[PDB]
Amino acid sequence: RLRVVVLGSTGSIGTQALQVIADNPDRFEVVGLAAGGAHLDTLLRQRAQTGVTNIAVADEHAAQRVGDIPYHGSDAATRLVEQTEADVVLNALVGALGLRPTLAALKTGARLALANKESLVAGGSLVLRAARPGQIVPVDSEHSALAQCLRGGTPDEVAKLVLTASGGPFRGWSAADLEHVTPEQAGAHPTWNTLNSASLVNKGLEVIETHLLFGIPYDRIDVVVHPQSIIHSMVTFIDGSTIAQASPPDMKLPISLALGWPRRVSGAAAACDFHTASSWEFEPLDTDVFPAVELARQAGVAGGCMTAVYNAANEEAAAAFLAGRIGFPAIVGIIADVLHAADQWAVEPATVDDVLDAQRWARERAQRAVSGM
Amino acid sequence: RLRVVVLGSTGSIGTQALQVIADNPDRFEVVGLAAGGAHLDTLLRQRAQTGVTNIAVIPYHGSDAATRLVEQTEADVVLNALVGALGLRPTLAALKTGARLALANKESLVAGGSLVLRAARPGQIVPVDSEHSALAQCLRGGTPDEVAKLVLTASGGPFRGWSAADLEHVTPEQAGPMNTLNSASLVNKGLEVIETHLLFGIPYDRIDVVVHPQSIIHSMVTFIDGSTIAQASPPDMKLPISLALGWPRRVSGAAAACDFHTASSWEFEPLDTDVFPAVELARQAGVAGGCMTAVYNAANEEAAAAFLAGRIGFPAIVGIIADVLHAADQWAVEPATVDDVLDAQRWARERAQRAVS
Ligand SMILES: O=C(c1ccccc1Cn1cncn1)N(O)CC[C@@H](c1ccc(Cl)c(Cl)c1)P(=O)(O)O
Numbered sequence A: 001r002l003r004v005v006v007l008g009s010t011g012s013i014g015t016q017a018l019q020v021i022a023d024n025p026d027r028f029e030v031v032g033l034a035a036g037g038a039h040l041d042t043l044l045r046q047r048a049q050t051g052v053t054n055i056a057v058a059d060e061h062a063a064q065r066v067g068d069i070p071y072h073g074s075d076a077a078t079r080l081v082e083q084t085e086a087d088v089v090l091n092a093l094v095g096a097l098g099l100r101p102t103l104a105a106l107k108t109g110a111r112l113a114l115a116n117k118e119s120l121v122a123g124g125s126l127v128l129r130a131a132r133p134g135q136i137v138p139v140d141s142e143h144s145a146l147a148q149c150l151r152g153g154t155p156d157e158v159a160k161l162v163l164t165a166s167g168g169p170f171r172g173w174s175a176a177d178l179e180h181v182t183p184e185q186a187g188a189h190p191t192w193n194t195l196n197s198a199s200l201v202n203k204g205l206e207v208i209e210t211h212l213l214f215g216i217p218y219d220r221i222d223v224v225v226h227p228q229s230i231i232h233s234m235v236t237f238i239d240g241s242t243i244a245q246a247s248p249p250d251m252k253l254p255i256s257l258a259l260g261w262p263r264r265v266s267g268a269a270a271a272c273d274f275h276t277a278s279s280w281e282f283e284p285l286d287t288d289v290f291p292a293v294e295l296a297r298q299a300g301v302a303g304g305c306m307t308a309v310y311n312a313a314n315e316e317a318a319a320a321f322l323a324g325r326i327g328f329p330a331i332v333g334i335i336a337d338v339l340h341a342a343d344q345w346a347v348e349p350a351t352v353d354d355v356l357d358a359q360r361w362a363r364e365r366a367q368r369a370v371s372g373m
Numbered sequence B: 001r002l003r004v005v006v007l008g009s010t011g012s013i014g015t016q017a018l019q020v021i022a023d024n025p026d027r028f029e030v031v032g033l034a035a036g037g038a039h040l041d042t043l044l045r046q047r048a049q050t051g052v053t054n055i056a057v058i059p060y061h062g063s064d065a066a067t068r069l070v071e072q073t074e075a076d077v078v079l080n081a082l083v084g085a086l087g088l089r090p091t092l093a094a095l096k097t098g099a100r101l102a103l104a105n106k107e108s109l110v111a112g113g114s115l116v117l118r119a120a121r122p123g124q125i126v127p128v129d130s131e132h133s134a135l136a137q138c139l140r141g142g143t144p145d146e147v148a149k150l151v152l153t154a155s156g157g158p159f160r161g162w163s164a165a166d167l168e169h170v171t172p173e174q175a176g177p178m179n180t181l182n183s184a185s186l187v188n189k190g191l192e193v194i195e196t197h198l199l200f201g202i203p204y205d206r207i208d209v210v211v212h213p214q215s216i217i218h219s220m221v222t223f224i225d226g227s228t229i230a231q232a233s234p235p236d237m238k239l240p241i242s243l244a245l246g247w248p249r250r251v252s253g254a255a256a257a258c259d260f261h262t263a264s265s266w267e268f269e270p271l272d273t274d275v276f277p278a279v280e281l282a283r284q285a286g287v288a289g290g291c292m293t294a295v296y297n298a299a300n301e302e303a304a305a306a307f308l309a310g311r312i313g314f315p316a317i318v319g320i321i322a323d324v325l326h327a328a329d330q331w332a333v334e335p336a337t338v339d340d341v342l343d344a345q346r347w348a349r350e351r352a353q354r355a356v357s
């Protein structure tokens, strides 16, 4: 029985992970839960339902609303990871909260089932340095597919990695059409991922993660638009053979595989039914209209903290768009402007502080680009 | 540098295999060539162009010439691309020497069955068919206990989606050369499903067939978690040939890969087994076992030849297979020798001609 710590337990990935674990008590036992703090109601139900009292809340003010959370405030999730004996740490925390628990999980020797994108994109080689071969197992559909498809040959036999992309809500839109796009049109409803999916920045992040997880050069990582999202990614080998992973969209599949790696979890998700006719479409990404992916490749080839800069510039430009300060195509315009000025940030991140410094620099630089304009 | 005997060197597989070898001298060395005899013109051209004098139809002549070539030649890989019963004996000989058997000859498995499997150690037979090659690759996607289903793709032939009525008027020219006909009738897939059960040990009820007209995905494995792993490539037999020769190592530049710089779509649909029962009949014959699969194949051969001669309609090809198998309840017994296999086939051929009359 594998002891699992679920970080970011109240989001979509976390709840689905708990469902997989609840369905499979023979293979998994939850030994810890952590939440950012936005969905304290969910976490308290999770404590009541799992009987797990080993729980953390990052938001100090949210935790004080309850008064009996064992780890709270600054680095609560990291401390839970450091102090809990576990076989697997699932990291589905949001944004910046993910990095230090990723590093803590890796130092414990546990398998890291990684859902948090910022960890790898921002942390880069800082994170890779902390890991042994095979210790990081990806939770993202695309990277899970790749990991599975890579079993099709040896590393020297790999020619290309092909990521599929839905294309988002603006697939087939003109550059002129995007000028008028509103946040709500992108599926975003401002508050105290859906936008990054619309801008294709999410796909650029996945390209960076692909390079870091699997060690394949950026010019051998392709993106293909596949609106059905049935094929989740593919690997082309040196002999001409492509191996692909397919399933009806259901995140419980890649979540189960990361938890149970390398053993598959029986009945995790429904398989492709070929009793109905279906048609799977493939088309090139319109790189003229959606340059986010090529910009990610650019940041990634330059290297080091440039990927933290790419991500941080995106967050700030995206927030400006949600605020109504800039238009939609300006998001990737600002990312490009920030990277062009980021010559000091190609260095490898030596410490967590290097990452946070790069991110702070990038945000301020994006703010300057936003303000004028 | 692997030493390769090519049996059936003048046919399609044989010739593509030699091109693969010639392109990879550091990986491969041809140490022997064999052919039926009808294609002597190209066989002697193959001698002059490869410098191989170890040939069988000249040191080796006769019906057993290919077997004797295999027994006396030191070889790591024997590619058996002989068509028909010509391949059965050389299959056993190659297996006996301990060499890897890259199998393209459907008969030795479909007819031979247990006879061939008992002469082989696990992993000695490496399949050359694109569908089986695809499954072998996709099975790397999990461990044996995690396999839920093997899924073979079928082009569906020229009569994809036609009605039973539409089929009655089909001419030899419309159906596309027996290999081509076997694709039109879905008997090819029937034979591959039988071979799949035999090569991989998966029960017939977990071997599915799906129609995929593009022939890009060559087969898939669905695992117990809901994941399916598929193998895709533009159709080119040099890919599964190269892999069967270099197993488990891939051969750089064997075939062109899928290019996604151009838009395409891949269609999947069920086979209407009311209109195309060839695969279902293959499952039945397979489950019965013994000499029943030899009967399936033999009856097809005669029914197919009768269609190509204008004697029966297209739908009658599989109808004759069903008839012959329905009378073959005597043949659900395990074959003890090669002659037991040939007996069932002679019987099937004769009972098939009866139906044609
Ligand atoms: O890989 C392929 C293959 C697939 C597509 C194109 C060429 C090849 C190579 N090829 C071998 N023999 C003849 N061609 N096959 O294994 C052929 C079987 C399938 C098939 C499919 C389309 C056609 Cl036009 C024909 Cl004739 C046969 P099927 O109908 O059993 O699926």
Ligand SMILES: [Mn+2]
Pocket (backbone or CB within 6 Å): A140, A141, A142, A206
């Ligand atoms: Mn994704």
